[PDB]
Design a protein around this ligand. Structure first.
Ligand SMILES: Nc1ncnc2c1ncn2[C@@H]1O[C@H](COP(=O)(O)OP(=O)(O)O)[C@@H](O)[C@H]1O
Lengths: 499, 514, 499
């Protein structure tokens, strides 16, 4: 019978079931091989990425979860739990001698009803600046309330809000870029109007450079360009190496003379520069930058309209930029090149301090969620309440719709509504309170006629979600439901032997 | 589900309890010895807890976490690296019976944090502050906290070194200290240990040469780091050697080759060269040394990396490399050099280092038979460690078991006063604080239960009474015995133990592997 | 854990689960011992009566079922299935870590809601003579449609209706009495205005008896009355036996002379008469009746206001009756004494024929149900529809009431409503049709707003129950529900070890 793939897909969802809610459980990931490592994690994405399975359905679910995590924000654990619950319900539904076609039809009807109820229940009262400000603040507070680390959250939230609000409704994702840097204290935040580098050649080179003018010269010294001044090596003696070295030296000195007569003061590039040309440039009086990143020059040329020289092709066609003030201020524990004196405040990089790690990932995720919710709600604000409010309403709508359709697909809708009323139960169980009584009270309040009723995590009571101040996104829940329904329809349609 | 995490937690608790019980009869001055057997059959007698913790090896997450906690405690504070294990074991034993009933770990962690905060505030409000802006009170505190670490004769022998090391008044009573940033205590064999004095600049022990006069002032250091090894051949013999021809070629390669490099290097002023350790060089050509004997010869070998780091930090320079260097950033300070022996064997040169931005001063100690030098080194190490620990704060208290009983009684009265289901968990902490006095009474040779009950009765009656004595073997007041300890050695230890307990309690679920 | 008694009580209900509905399954009851018997039954009462268990809960359930049967008529299988379903639901409810107090409270609330819904849904349109007639006809047709034997049902139904309608609202149960007699054909029904006996002495005695006058004489010949004419036996010889025999003969002849001078023609009694007094009475000219039943003389004295002579006490105080016409007509295959010529038409006995058995039990049960429903609805007609209509309405009312009570007893009401919607499923499964689709259609029709919707057994469709013509009793369902709730509350309160 069919049970192997179902069990394999259900067991993979129960591994990260305790990682839901703000008060989640931690676990270690012991590594094998030569050196046994030990680390503490608190997210399902890192556990699903650093694991290896062999079941087809499990691999498909892992790939779908990875695709969804790469698409939206942190949507990996909820969709997995929902798919596991849907599969566990479908197994018992099939065991009761029920054709899968009726189950698929009932699931489609339930998904359509849930989508209609979610689209019909959308707020739109944001005709002021303070309203959008408080909405963004509540969204950031709800997003940053997943690890339960009360140490430095308000300042980081305000910094992220100020960084994401400077875009002023501009649709771009290559301007604001963050870097990785540790050292200092958690209560240290630096504000600037530009960005920094990531590597310094030293201090032996002269730092006094006037008249800032960016000149991207893609002159390769080992790429075999036109008119090679040197030659190869023959098979006769061992005296041609000196001739090759002299030819390379005179070629590089001619290139240096050309780049000096062309007019430059601060030479920047991204190719591999040897020690001899670097020393020659340092002795001449021009600072050369080597070992550049893969996104620094691109983001520098994108915000100024510039581009690469196309490996020395048209030096009089590529438009170049210029600055005003460029220096090297010793900040923190490293010397970086400053990029000030510009009128474009779209590209900014805020350096961070502290003595902890695993922060840049969550910072980038929060910034992505923020800019997504900003570009989505540019003129039409669409936000919903959290704390287990939309799921209860969707389940109630599905239960109400599953009563006027005579036939045989009502059991599928009932199972869908039962599986949809399980996330608040797990959320309340992960904290340490009575989940059954809270779920019953929430269901009674939703059936009596109260669309604004949620649970509290600070005291474990039932209150209003519109008075305390907590919201989330609108398209995230819809995408989660769509992905869960698609995964359930894909996995349920397979029942034959694995060949 | 629930059975697997429960079994995992039970196994972790059992492993931690076994690790804590593997060593316990070693707290106090009257501890028992242990003979650790090596893998080859050698046995070593020891009694320190840190040595046993760092010598044994076992693969387990809880054991590795406990080892890391002990290492962090020894690095931060530096004293009492064995009581934290017992505290963690008692806390885990209490959490075992707390979880056996059916309590969520979140409430237990909150109760533990509240109890830790209350104990820290009680320890800070109970301790008395002192003063240290002058030198009389600081010297009094030093001589009061130094006469209780070792035996009487060793203390009297280390008192001169202690009062010589405590005289280093550099920081004007700041928040932190830099006793581990600019200190390089060297060791010298031969002579009398009484000839000790603080020395600035730099101290070496390698002979320069053996020629005429070598009393100059040319930076006294050769800032060079390029390669000085001879070019190795591709094989043994490239051709057949017998008569001349091949002999003249190798003669010119040994005489007229490196000499050109020596001549082109010596064209720059300050002809001072040196080399690092001779760990990779097979043999140095003596012809180069004979040719360098003229126009002043100065060379110093046997130099490690720590010596280079100390010289580049005390003087205030940066080493350079590469051959193509036409700059002038390699000079130093010229004052005085060329020192002789101090009536005995063993070569050792000293430079006072006048007019230098770095005022780093070290202590040059000696000894004989390699028996009183390491002891004095450990003595001055403990001395400057406790000096830094005392200068980090200002609070102090006496030990013996009285603060533990006081904290236990305070936690009991707080759990009796405070309302809520978490109070029971707080009561568990009240049962995890009377382990040190009981262990001390058991190791002394008396009834532990009766002594603990008498101490509790005295604390409930006259608040601060006495503790547990070791020399006399009774219950006497601590104010007569010159023995104290800083408040950080307890506060930091309790905070680290609570953090480790919370970390080991928050980790559960399943332990997947590759 | 507690599971032994639950399994023992659940397995005892699944033995007769296939004996529900008109199209039930038959089974054999093989007996052990010396002679292995074989018979075919089609009722759960006979199976539960001829069985032996050892569990305490099973014995209590069997005793309660037998008591309820002997009280109401029929419904043992129904109450057993209901108790088994309730226990199966309670086991799963307890396995989910639920206190039995909340379950008991929810069951009490569900029972109260069901009783209120049954009391609020009662018809009362019977102010005509033909209305009661058609109601009784429908009740008899629904009661007789449990064995599926289409051979001789209409005539027997009409005969039972005519026999139960002659009471004319008189509350009595000792007048109408049935007897057991086989022989003849199924299409043979005899109508009379009186009753018959059950034993005949023969034909040698004279049958010509005029002036009918019932005289109950309790003159015992071997009960040692006052003034014994004889004596005992001595220990000396074997000649006193003849003297004792002569004394007994003269005593019985004096008693015969006394009963002849008292005035009698048809002597009837119930004691044990020997051969010599019977022969003497036959030779004298008086017919003596011996070996009477335990209910014939009692009913004869009750319908005529008479009583027994109290074993010869007050002969001038006990009132006696008299008749007009008494003969012996050879009817069927046996000669019985007729009881005609009376003005009291309350006591009647209709003799039956045929070549089958196991009919008197169902006949008596039908007559009991008929007279019960007649004495209950003397002036207030209360009837409900059948075919699975009241159970669906009760389940819907319980589900609607289980939605405004916040707490933890809603799961018990949900389980009760789920267990209450299982009798139509078993009824449809016992026939051979799709029970799931029919149950779903019935639930949809009941939720849409149709209180008159039932299932058909002739074609397997969904139609109206008020158009075809089918009803039942009102107090039967209420008593069944009350007994089931009481048994469930009694069994659920036991969970400790059996000591
Ligand atoms: N002079 C003393 N009088 C009483 N108790 C002492 C004395 N010296 C040390 N102790 C006790 O010994 C304990 C520490 O013993 P031990 O483990 O050998 O040293 P450490 O903790 O530095 O490794 C302390 O808790 C302290 O109470």
């Amino acid at each position: 019978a069919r049970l192997t793939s179902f069990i394999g897909a259900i067991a993979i969802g129960d591994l990260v079931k305790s990682t839901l809610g703000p008060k989640g459980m931690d676990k270690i990931l012991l590594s094998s091989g030569r050196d046994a490592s030990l680390m503490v994690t608190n997210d399902g994405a890192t556990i699903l990425k650093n694991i290896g399975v062999d079941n087809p359905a499990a691999k498909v679910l892992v790939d779908m979860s990875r695709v969804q995590d790469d698409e939206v924000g942190d949507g990996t654990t909820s969709v997995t739990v929902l798919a596991a619950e849907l599969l566990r319900e479908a197994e018992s539904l099939i065991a009761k001698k029920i054709h899968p076609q009726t189950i698929i039809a009932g699931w489609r009807e339930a998904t359509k009803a849930a989508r209609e109820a979610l689209l019909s229940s959308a707020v739109d009262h944001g005709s002021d600046e303070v309203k959008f400000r408080q909405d963004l603040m509540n969204i950031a507070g709800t997003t940053l309330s997943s690890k339960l680390l009360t140490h430095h959250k308000d300042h980081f939230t305000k910094l992220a809000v100020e960084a994401v609000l400077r875009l002023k409704g501009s649709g771009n994702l290559e301007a604001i870029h963050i870097i990785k840097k540790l050292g200092g204290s958690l209560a240290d935040s630096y504000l600037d109007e530009g960005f920094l580098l990531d590597k310094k050649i030293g201090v032996n080179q002269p730092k006094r450079i006037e008249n800032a003018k960016i000149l991207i010269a893609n002159t390769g010294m080992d790429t075999d360009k036109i008119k090679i001044f040197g030659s190869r090596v023959r098979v006769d003696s061992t005296a041609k190496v000196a001739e090759i070295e002299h030819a390379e030296k005179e070629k590089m000195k001619e290139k240096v003379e050309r780049i000096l007569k062309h007019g430059i003061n601060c030479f920047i590039n991204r190719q591999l520069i040897y020690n001899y040309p670097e020393q020659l440039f340092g002795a001449a009086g021009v600072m050369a930058i080597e070992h550049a990143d893969f996104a620094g020059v691109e983001r520098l040329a994108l915000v100024t309209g510039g581009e690469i020289a196309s490996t020395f092709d048209h030096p009089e066609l590529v438009k170049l930029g210029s600055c005003k003030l460029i220096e090297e201020v010793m900040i923190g524990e490293d010397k970086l090149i400053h990029f000030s004196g510009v009128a474009l405040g779209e590209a900014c990089t805020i350096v961070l301090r502290g003595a902890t790690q695993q922060i840049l990932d969550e910072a980038e995720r929060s910034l992505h969620d923020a800019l997504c919710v900003l570009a989505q709600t540019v003129k039409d604000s669409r936000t919903v309440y959290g704390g287990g409010c939309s799921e209860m309403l969707m389940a109630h709508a599905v239960t109400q719709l599953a009563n006027r359709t005579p036939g045989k697909e009502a059991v599928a809708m009932e199972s869908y509504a039962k599986a949809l009323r399980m996330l608040p139960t797990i959320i309340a169980d992960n904290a340490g309170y009575d989940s059954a009584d809270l779920v019953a009270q929430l269901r009674a309040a939703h059936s009596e006629g109260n669309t604004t009723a949620g649970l509290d995590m600070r005291e474990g009571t039932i209150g209003d979600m519109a008075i305390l101040g907590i919201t989330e996104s609108f398209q995230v829940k819809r995408q989660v439901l769509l992905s869960a329904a698609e995964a359930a329809e894909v996995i349920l349609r397979v029942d034959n032997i694995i060949k | 589900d629930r059975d697997k995490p429960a079994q995992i937690r039970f196994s972790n608790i059992s492993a931690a309890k076994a690790v804590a019980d593997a060593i316990r009869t070693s707290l106090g001055p009257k501890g028992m010895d242990k003979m650790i057997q090596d893998g080859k059959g050698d046995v070593t007698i020891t009694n320190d807890g840190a040595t046993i913790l760092k010598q044994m090896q076992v693969l387990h997450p809880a054991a590795r976490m406990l080892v890391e906690l002990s290492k962090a405690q020894d690095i931060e504070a530096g004293d009492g690296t064995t009581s934290v294990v017992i505290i963690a074991g008692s806390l885990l034993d209490s959490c075992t019976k707390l979880l056996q009933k059916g309590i969520h770990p979140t409430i237990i962690s909150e109760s533990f944090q509240k109890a830790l905060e209350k104990g820290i505030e009680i320890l800070t409000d109970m301790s008395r502050p002192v003063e240290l802006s002058d030198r009389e009170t600081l010297l009094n505190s030093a001589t009061t906290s130094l006469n209780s670490k070792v035996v009487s004769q060793y203390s009297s022998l280390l008192s001169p070194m202690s009062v010589n090391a405590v005289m280093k008044v550099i920081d004007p009573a700041t928040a932190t200290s830099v006793d581990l940033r600019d200190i390089k205590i060297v060791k010298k064999l031969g002579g009398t240990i009484d000839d000790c004095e603080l020395v600035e600049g730099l101290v070496l022990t390698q002979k320069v040469s053996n020629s005429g006069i070598t009393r100059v002032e040319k930076a006294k250091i050769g800032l060079i780091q390029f390669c000085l090894s001879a070019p190795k051949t591709d094989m043994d013999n490239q051709i057949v050697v017998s008569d001349y021809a091949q002999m003249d070629r190798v003669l010119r390669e040994e005489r007229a080759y490196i000499l050109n490099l020596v001549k082109q290097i010596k064209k720059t002023g300050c002809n001072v060269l040196l080399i690092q350790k001779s760990i990779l060089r097979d043999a140095l050509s003596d012809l180069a040394l004979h040719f360098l004997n003229k126009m002043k010869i100065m060379v110093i070998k046997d130099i490690e990396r720590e010596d280079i780091e100390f010289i580049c930090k005390t003087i205030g320079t940066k080493p350079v490399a590469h051959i193509d260097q036409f700059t002038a950033d390699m000079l130093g300070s010229a004052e005085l050099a060329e020192e002789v022996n101090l009536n005995g064997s063993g070569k050792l040169l000293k430079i006072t280092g006048c007019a230098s931005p770095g005022k780093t001063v070290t202590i040059v100690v000696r000894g004989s038979n390699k028996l009183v030098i390491e002891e004095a080194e450990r003595s001055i190490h403990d001395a400057l460690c406790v000096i830094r620990c005392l200068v980090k704060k200002r609070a102090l208290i006496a030990g013996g078991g009285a603060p533990e009983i006081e904290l236990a009684l305070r936690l009991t009265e707080y759990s009796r006063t405070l309302s809520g289901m978490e109070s029971y968990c707080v009561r568990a902490f009240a049962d995890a604080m009377e382990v040190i006095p009981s262990t001390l009474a058991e190791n002394a040779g008396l009834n532990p239960i009766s002594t603990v009950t008498e101490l509790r009765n005295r604390h409930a009656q006259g608040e601060k009474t006495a503790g547990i004595n070791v020399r006399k073997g009774g219950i006497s007041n601590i104010l007569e015995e010159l023995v104290v300890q800083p408040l950080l050695v307890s506060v930091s230890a309790l905070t680290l133990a609570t953090e480790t307990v919370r970390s080991i309690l928050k980790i559960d679920d399943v332990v997947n592997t590759r």
